[PDB]
Design a protein around this nucleic acid. Structure first.
Lengths: 98, 95, 92, 83, 97, 85, 105, 96
DNA sequence: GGATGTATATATCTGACACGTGCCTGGAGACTAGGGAGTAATCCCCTTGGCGGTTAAAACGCGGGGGACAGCGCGTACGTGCGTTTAAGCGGTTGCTAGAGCTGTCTACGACCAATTGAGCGGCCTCGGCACCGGGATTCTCC
DNA sequence: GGAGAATCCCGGTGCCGAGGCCGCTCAATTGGTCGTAGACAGCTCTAGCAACCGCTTAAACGCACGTACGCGCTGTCCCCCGCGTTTTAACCGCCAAGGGGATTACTCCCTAGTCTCCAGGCACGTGTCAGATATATACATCC
């Protein structure tokens, strides 16, 4: 039959096969279930989109059409839950909140 | 013409709006090489490595100065003093 | 052959903001971010499987690791997204 | 060649700028030596681990990933250099 | 009659409670509090006694460590009485609130 | 289904908070410290118990064990020795 | 059938450490001398902490080590207190320490 | 049915104690604390050596990884005496 | 009201961003075999709930003193501006060195099987450590 | 300085239950063998790191003057501590019931391993504008 990717079956953009490979070759357990890479890829894609939307809103507020680390820093620190998740993380060339 | 002591500290808004590094690069690089001299002789560095060190250290110092200012305000002052840095570092868990 | 997530990040960006670019430094920051969260979730799921004397890492371990790691509403929405994806993948 | 008073290369105006970005108005004169000591301690703690990672790999050049791992292992993750 | 000066009893009690190791909170109230907090995450839960004891040990260690930093802040402000702002400053600099 | 416990934070009495502050080396205490400490303890217990009940539910049990509490504490950077592990 | 701990001159079990390494999902393979090295380091740290704990026990006219003695030994040592800086010892108490500002004058 | 055998380090900790303090005993709670300490140190060193092997694209955890992990984790003279103890043990094991 | 730093608009314009090519490595499909996992049944232990006593701790109220807080004065140290000096940054050059990739070899580790001994559980005892008491000594507050 | 007094510590007394010693069993460790892939050594080679140099100019440095803030002292008053009395609920010791977690045995289905085949992502090469820097300016902030 024709080869359909596993991420097109789940309706995702992130690579399910690469995530499965990185789970297998990362020494996490002896076996890896069939739906664990799909779940993980969906979660990673969701978090990526959540950050990127706020960063693009920040970029538009500053009359820019291109996201730079300053916009990522602003988007993260102005959001409560994202700031809690990335609390011990430093973003290079991000600055601080005025 | 002279601005009141305080008005030219404008500087807070200027340096909280920008993102560039506030320490100069050659002195910091010399300091890093001198510090690393005591762990192994004849070491080499990627430029990427020195820039990462500078980013990390500047972020650390800015985050420490914020807590130092909190302590100075707690003591009902506006001037930061070495005792403020010491209290901040001790409550964090570093002293 | 340095694999990165740059193209998938770009595909997602084209969905949220169709007319917005991104620079190399911001793209590398996003790559570091996705690698970091992958490592966190995978390590937590590994520990969960070890605690219960299991050999397999399943979607249930991933769900519990997400509920342990993400705060508040992020966890709820990520659980819904993951469940929807696994449901779509299975019946297809 | 050996190196000397390089901690004095961290000048007073640079420390004032770092404090301005932190939101500080007035600064005591005794803050600069305290800040230099704190910076030196932090740098020593990070560079020790970076050189350990470099020596374990049988390398002579310290790379950015060594610094990234050294910072990560003490709870100071840094995005922007991991590739 | 006889009355010790305000502060002698305080230092006496500080020595007394720094010399001992037992738990300083009553056990039945702490257990009721734990069950009440837990009934909001799942109903009809059961606890091992050792689980409640571990919770009490961790909670008391946390509170004593917080009071030490609170005292440090109160002294920094040139006082001997601890106030809620000292707790707030301690938790702010730690990274909790 | 048992009963619904309510108003149990007041069981953390004032003498007990005074004893905790004494072991903390504190000499004088304001009257507004007790409610602040009750709130702080409630937040701390809520976080730890949330994580412990998550572990208990993943293991598909109905009883919370001591190892659940140990894991919940450890994943928050508050390792505890003496209760297994 | 000679044991590996006796070959290495140790008290801790080299076979059990090897099994835990092989079954802990740390790497695909485990070297031959890794369990020996790790068992030696674990036994060294055990002896280091137990010596100080026993000294603390003897300073109090006791002949058994209890968690209070372990707490005293760990917190009175500059390096053990840094190794165990985020560890809570049950029934250990604290170190007697009163601030000098609170003492009478 | 039958009680499952639980594993601990009680006998080895007791042997080390009888080596250091021949006339001192130990209680049950203190032995549980020592067991937890040994397990925690084992897990820390093993995880760090695992990350070390993954960083260099290796598949084997050797004694070099253990030594580098001990140097990264232990502070001060603890690290020096630990690497000397480990090296001496490995040398004696190999010479046999 | 005049001084002065501050955001706004326009012109330049380039180096980084987005797009088009070959391919080869990694992902998908199909089949096979075995062990991990789920189900059902059994059982006992340990969790929950209740009662009763008893007594030690908590709660409450009053008096008083000492510590927090506000105000005032003073002197010092920090900021501000200006003129001078220095060294960082940039643009080049050169050299050479170490990290990276490739190839071949071989030793060390996993897998499997058999033998056996060390370690964990169940008993069996006995003394370090604790509650209680008495005496002496010690800090503590008033004269 | 003494002197009376709550308060703490040492010695001595029972007294117990938890720590220390021992036997039996079985599962985990050890020894031996074989296969094979990961790791190591040697070679090449090229990118990138170190070093030098020259010039520009902006940033650092040093000095002086003024003033705003930190610090110390004093007085007030309120609110925390100490103590005595009363009231309440924790704790300890029972008992009774049952549910749920651990164990055992069996089945079966899902995941690893193998191999084949192809397509998607990644370097390489190419064309274009978003954002930075300049020049001028009205404006908002400040004294």
């Amino acid at each position: 039959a024709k080869a359909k990717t596993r991420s097109s079956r789940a309706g995702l953009q992130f690579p399910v096969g690469r995530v499965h490979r990185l789970l297998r070759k990362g020494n996490y357990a002896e076996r890896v279930g069939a739906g664990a890479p799909v779940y993980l890829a969906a979660v990673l894609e969701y978090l990526t989109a959540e950050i990127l939307e706020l960063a693009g809103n920040a970029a538009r507020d500053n009359k820019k059409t291109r996201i730079i680390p300053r916009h990522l820093q602003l988007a993260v620190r102005n959001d409560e839950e994202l700031n809690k998740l990335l609390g011990r993380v430093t973003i290079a060339q991000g600055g601080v909140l005025p | 013409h002279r601005y009141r002591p305080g008005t030219v500290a404008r500087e807070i808004r200027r340096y909280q709006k920008s993102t560039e590094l506030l320490i100069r690069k050659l002195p910091f690089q010399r300091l890093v090489r001198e510090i690393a001299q005591d762990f192994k002789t004849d070491l080499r560095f990627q430029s990427s490595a020195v820039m990462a060190l500078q980013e990390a250290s500047e972020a650390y110092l800015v985050a420490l100065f914020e807590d130092t200012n909190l302590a100075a305000i707690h003591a009902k002052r506006v001037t930061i003093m070495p005792k403020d840095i010491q209290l901040a570092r001790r409550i964090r868990g570093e002293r | 052959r340095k694999e990165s997530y740059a193209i998938y990040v770009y595909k997602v960006l084209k969905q949220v903001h169709p007319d917005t670019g991104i620079s190399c430094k911001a793209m590398s920051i996003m790559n570091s971010f996705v690698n970091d969260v992958f490592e966190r979730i995978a390590g937590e799921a590994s520990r969960l499987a070890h605690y219960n004397k299991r050999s397999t890492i399943t979607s249930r371990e991933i769900q519990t690791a997400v509920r342990l790691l993400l705060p508040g509403e992020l966890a709820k929405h990520a659980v819904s997204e993951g469940t929807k994806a696994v449901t779509k993948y299975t019946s297809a | 060649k050996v190196l000397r008073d390089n901690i004095q290369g961290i000048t007073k105006p640079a420390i004032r700028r770092l404090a301005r970005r932190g939101g500080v108005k007035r600064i005591s004169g005794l803050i600069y030596e305290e800040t230099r000591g704190v910076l030196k301690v932090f740098l020593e703690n990070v560079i020790r681990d970076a050189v350990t990672y470099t020596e374990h790999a049988k390398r002579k050049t310290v790379t950015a990933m060594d610094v990234v791992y050294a910072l990560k292992r003490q709870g100071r993750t840094l995005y922007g250099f991991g590739g």
